[PDB]
Symmetry: D2
Subunit: 475 residues, 4 copies
């Protein structure tokens, strides 16, 4: 059942002398092994990418788009095969895992068509000074070079493809470093690009141990761009190693849901629960604190409680709403946040149970700012409700977070909601709906500790391109 | 003078307990002093700016633009007065220094009108998935926050204003840190903005000693964006301190002038000498090596020699072509490159002479790429001619540089020149003209060790803004 | 009272015949304007086409500088120009001065918008691999000579809204003001002349429609017609246009849809301000209220009270309601009012006419059988039409041959957006009156309300074309 | 014998009477198409306007999916369709199949271009401080019912170039092919039908010009007219359009300017390929060589050699030069040749005519008194006109009433760019023949050559309008 996997290096599939065995978090089942690359093997990956860059960047846009469409078609063909393993590898619900692969194909196809019709511009010297009226600048787009793409355990295929396809269509070459927990899924994605015929070296994979290659892959001079999704502390560390090279960071969140007195409380509760407890709360973009006006807090809390009690809690193969968390340390961290809130007097509206690393969904009311749960990102199924007296207080508490990814506002007064949104230190505000990354053409960005750079398809392509200006005088 | 200059801090002018005396590099004349700020005084600058940000970013674009236009009008009025002091401070020709101030006013006016008409976008959910066809995203621009602007000694007013005005029109607040040599000119620029009535704390200045505040100003958590122009080693140091903050870097160059067999050799010589020896070669964008096809090399070299022999060598007040270099270490470094070239057998077509830090312009022919002068950026008045026998060889030698700012191609075959330009690892290619940053609406950027980010006016405004997306569902 | 002259090739020209202009509110003689012959029109157009080559070869910054100087002069002389504008078209004095100030704002904005226009570079490899080395360099060019035709109700604002966008792009311009409104147009032209505009780059034409009306439009020197005025006149220009591009800003019958959850005091304030500005002589203006039954009685009472507060009198006293532009216009409005009365509409405010000064008339219980439900009055009369469902409101709104703008008053903004998608109009204002501003926003109408998109950047693009230069990289 | 039918409201429909179509090169009977009455046109338009509401409220994703499906089907059937197209308009068999393949490329590209078009959010504070809380949300909308009128010389390519851009934006479409070319248009329609296009969203009309010609255009259901064809027919559509927006792709007389430093072998190759493609029956095609005296003798000789190698024969044999579309077309070309000869032009290749198959004629020493210097032949005849200066070449080029494209052959690119600025044309090609492609590039013509800008993204923009929703942030 369990298979030995290999890295894609310069069109070939390569083992290493050592490997890493990967086990299913929900069951402990052995899923397979991936190579534990050395620094010398990382050198070979990067050497082949740089050699392939010249012939890749001089292909036409339409030729590069064709490879991407073919790889998307293969992902769709094999989505049940790949999704089944992804489900086991990161304890994601089976149907949700298959949906991840299908969404990745949609992003790949969309990026191919977005990127191929990008344009340059022509600028007039006479816009700025009369003496230069016959001088014009022809400005065309060019790739940045080699892109290091680092995907996360919670979206090991979706947030690999969100990086690979925008980079490739622009004419960049790519090396994908998946997280160890999620490396099998990353290599299954690689297989699709290889079968699609991506030229040798244009796309490669790297797997290995942090203690062996963790810093080495980022500090290497061959890398021209670093594109990372993961934890905030790891993201900060990457910034210290970037030097002059551009970087994109998609890190943590503590998204607020602001609920005003005129809100539809039943609809707010439905959206809040869907957003907060998806994939057991192991998502950066997700409602992680409710800031609710006193007058409606009792009723909102009862509506939320009713739905939380109905969530299914169990195994990935059963498509449970709440599945086991990624590992024991992660579950320990969440249990600690829950104990701090209990010990400081918060009202537990649903009960805490832990079976292995399967934590039941916990809803707290009367949370206050002295509780860790008011501020820290749990990455687990626990939601605090914080009561406020004015909208001004909700804005202040919201913005006091070190995080600034997204926010939700629930109200029937949209002109007022827009005014609140202007004051919120976040990337995106959703009105009468949960926070979410989609649709993937929309911008996706975070402020403060939540990241750097703007993604969403067209924004990610622009981030991973530069310009080349040719200037001449008309006669 | 005994003229004690002062920093602009929250609408007030402040001395510090200690000061730094500034002397003219060409003559030793005492020009005055600037404050030697403490770390706590930097704290106050940044606290003032973050306080001012809330009310500044909520003004209308038209209101912000009005302040910039008024500041530009004052700079034009005081161009002779300011340029007279700038000339002394950095040993730039008097007329050239006045021209710098006039050009700064042009950039400020253009940035105000470019920024105030920036637009947002509305994106359709149904471009990506049918189920989201009623979901739209209203995407509007917002400032990034506090911009740290660091100006260079060779354009202490032009490449201060190039940062300040684009930052301010977008709703950012700014702190300007000038180099010590160039701090008087920076504070003179600040006077114009204060007299225009810029609100207290929206624009401030910092001056002091690197050993006291150098890293502190960059690492401070109040700073949200770093915009730097200066030397490559200093720029690399700033990259190591940026962390997650976006940065722009404008560093050194070693621009090649590629001269083909069909070129207008007299025109090539005129452009080459103008670009290479302006401000004594102390410019990042400047022809720094001639790569010439051997069949026309003898004729080109004689044309260049004739012009170099005629360049005037002397004092800034007399508008000499070649003025004294910025300090003794700079001249020593240039002397060492010349000595290496001479010792390795290059042909000195004009004679090296040095009086104080005034080096006469040196033209070398038959330079080979084992010579330091073929690669290292002198920031002084010395130019090598390197002979090649194919355009492919010229392209390889050009791209072998660690620098990638601009290049010139001299030829009558423009379709061929466009094909060469595609292969050159640079930001901008000029056909039958010297390299140059203008016109200032055109993009200005460098590849490799030449920097990061895209300037030119509209590009610099884009770089110092982010977006805020508000998403809702139509019913 | 002065004898006015046309600007022609940098000089001020009299004609053999002239037309005396009188103030509509008083009968005061204001002056005369030339009555140009067809041969004089030929001379204007000849000067323009001769001036075009040098004008289009100037840099953008050079053309922008002329526009900024003209705007500065208009600001300087706003009181002087506004005082005569107010008399010429019976517009309140202060509103007339504000028109001139707004026109300067538009001229300056068009100068700076137009000078940073950019082109595109397109890649053959976006479409086919074999063409990857072929690129298209696409740059904007002027269209040529623009004929700008201004309206009586904004004789300076909606002259400058055409002239400045045209000029920054490198077009040359001939302005034909309406006879009633020609003095104000010629006062605007004085500022462009004093600003130093090269001879022939900007010219004016005045005269009688029966002599030069059709002639000026079908003349083949004209490459673009940009017209604001009545729907029937506009429709006549579309046929004489041939293949030449045209922009039309014609009539409106803007609906104000008021739902059950609306702030009725806010709706009433905006409806009255929009409907009765300049005595209702505006294409963009609330011209029919479509209100849900449940809130109709309360809304009507509130609107009535605000209508009764409007002042009714002379332009020099800054009256809200001033005399209409001419007797025929007042006669037409009186006939619409009488039709509504004879068909059973409730006159919430009463009809009173002194000369051509009509008091503001508010009707309730207006039905689709009445002319006032549909025809544009260009006078101070407003109907209220009760509806039973939002669907009925949308149907009645779209049944109009006009489709300029609409207002929606409601606290449910997602629902308001869904309604706006269904309304056959250019612009929908949420919880506000309809309006053209701000002038950077698009301004357009559907159906009989016109053609083309204005607002500053849109107008500049409309009066430019593109030139593509294609070559293969080697 | 095959009785073709129109696509109307999702059904295939005959009419009472039909029109028999014959192959121009051979006389073969190809089938019949319906001769619709005016009442039948009413029914087509009624079905389309009924379908519009449900079609424009689909997602972009869903409309794009139908277009991709139709393109896939055209590729599948490209041989079958191309074989009939070849016979219907006497186009080389291989060239006809290639037309179908290119049409699928355009349909796919339009689907993906149109689905990611965006709107704008404008700030009131850009224009005035007091409006800084007011924003405009500006989204694109379809114009409604688009009438597409395709030409005989590209009866599939320049049908789909209209249909696909219109449909992705949310318009409904009626296609009126020309009678000669109607079978090919109906074969294209089959692919859209099999793709599942909803009933009434896409429809076809066939009939005689005398019965329905003006009727289909004047009909008030039509909101947009997108026409390709002869200049005299296009000028007639401009009148009937009223206020409605139109696009016209009409005739051309493209100049090839050859300077003293040109690569004459390259110039001759491109000139002959462009001038004689499809026997010269193309609006975009070199139709006059303007060559500097000192290289004219050698250029003419190198052009002559290439013309003499062109094959002259039948469409099914992929001949370079095929019989012209009908007898009147050939008669008109013969008259131009006779006029040039009688006025002293030199026949470097000789006139011969068999039926409507005219051998390719190259004339040197053509002067401006000859009709062939100016009139569009739509046949295989090319004049060479000698000039003494580049200034003279520019003047003669711009004296034409046509202004579609131009070629400049020279090794001095900066000078060629400056010349291109002075040429009154849409597109200038450097060191290459004139051409419409690649299809993402703009395609437009000045003066009598048409109105509007096509190429894929430009054609989507042309067939949309905007809807602005404005509100105040609190």
């Amino acid at each position: 059942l369990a298979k030995q996997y290999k890295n894609l290096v310069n069109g070939e599939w390569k083992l290493s002398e050592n490997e890493i065995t990967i086990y299913a978090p929900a069951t402990g089942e052995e899923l397979g092994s991936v190579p534990a690359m050395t620094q010398a093997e990382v050198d070979a990956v990067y050497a082949s990418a740089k050699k392939a860059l010249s012939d890749w960047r001089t292909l036409s846009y339409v030729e590069r788009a064709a490879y991407l469409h073919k790889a998307a078609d293969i992902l769709v063909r094999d989505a049940e095969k790949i999704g089944a393993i992804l489900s086991k590898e990161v304890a994601k619900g089976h149907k949700a895992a298959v949906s991840e692969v299908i969404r990745t194909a949609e992003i790949i196809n969309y990026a191919a068509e977005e990127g191929l019709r990008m344009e340059g511009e022509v600028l007039e010297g006479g816009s700025f000074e009369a003496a230069s009226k016959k001088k014009i600048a022809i400005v065309r787009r060019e790739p940045v070079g080699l892109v290091l793409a680092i995907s996360p355990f919670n979206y090991p295929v979706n947030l690999a493809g969100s990086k690979i396809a925008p980079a490739l269509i622009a004419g960049n070459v790519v090396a994908l470093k998946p997280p160890t927990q999620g490396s099998i899924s990353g290599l299954l994605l690689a297989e699709a690009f290889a079968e699609a015929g991506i030229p040798a070296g244009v796309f490669n994979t790297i797997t290995g141990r942090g203690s062996v290659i963790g810093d080495y892959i980022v500090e290497h001079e061959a890398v021209n761009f670093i594109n990372f999704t993961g934890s905030t502390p790891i993201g900060e560390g990457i910034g210290k190693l970037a030097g002059m090279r551009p970087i994109m960071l998609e890190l943590g969140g503590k998204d607020s849901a602001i609920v005003l007195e005129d809100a539809d409380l039943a609809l707010a509760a439905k959206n809040i629960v869907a957003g907060a407890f998806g994939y057991s709360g192991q998502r950066s973009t997700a409602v992680k604190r409710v800031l609710v006006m006193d007058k409606v807090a009792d009723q909102l809390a009862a509506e939320i409680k009713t739905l939380v009690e109905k969530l299914s809690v169990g195994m990935p193969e059963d498509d449970a709403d709440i599945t086991p968390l990624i590992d024991t340390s992660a579950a320990d961290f969440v249990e600690g946040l829950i104990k701090d809130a209990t010990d400081k007097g918060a009202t537990a509206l649903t009960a805490f149970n832990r079976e292995g690393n399967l934590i039941s969904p916990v809803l707290f009311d009367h949370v206050t700012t002295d509780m860790r749960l008011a501020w820290e990102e749990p990455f687990g199924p626990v939601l605090p409700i914080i009561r406020v007296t004015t909208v001004e207080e909700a804005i202040k508490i919201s913005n006091e977070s070190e995080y600034g990814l997204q926010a939700s506002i629930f109200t029937t007064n949209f002109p007022k909601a827009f005014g609140i949104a202007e004051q919120l230190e976040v990337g995106t505000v959703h009105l009468n709906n949960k926070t979410q990354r989609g649709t993937d053409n929309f911008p996706f960005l975070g402020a403060k500790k939540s990241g750097a750079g703007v993604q969403g398809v067209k924004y990610s392509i622009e981030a991973m391109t530069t310009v080349k200006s040719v200037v001449f005088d008309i006669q």
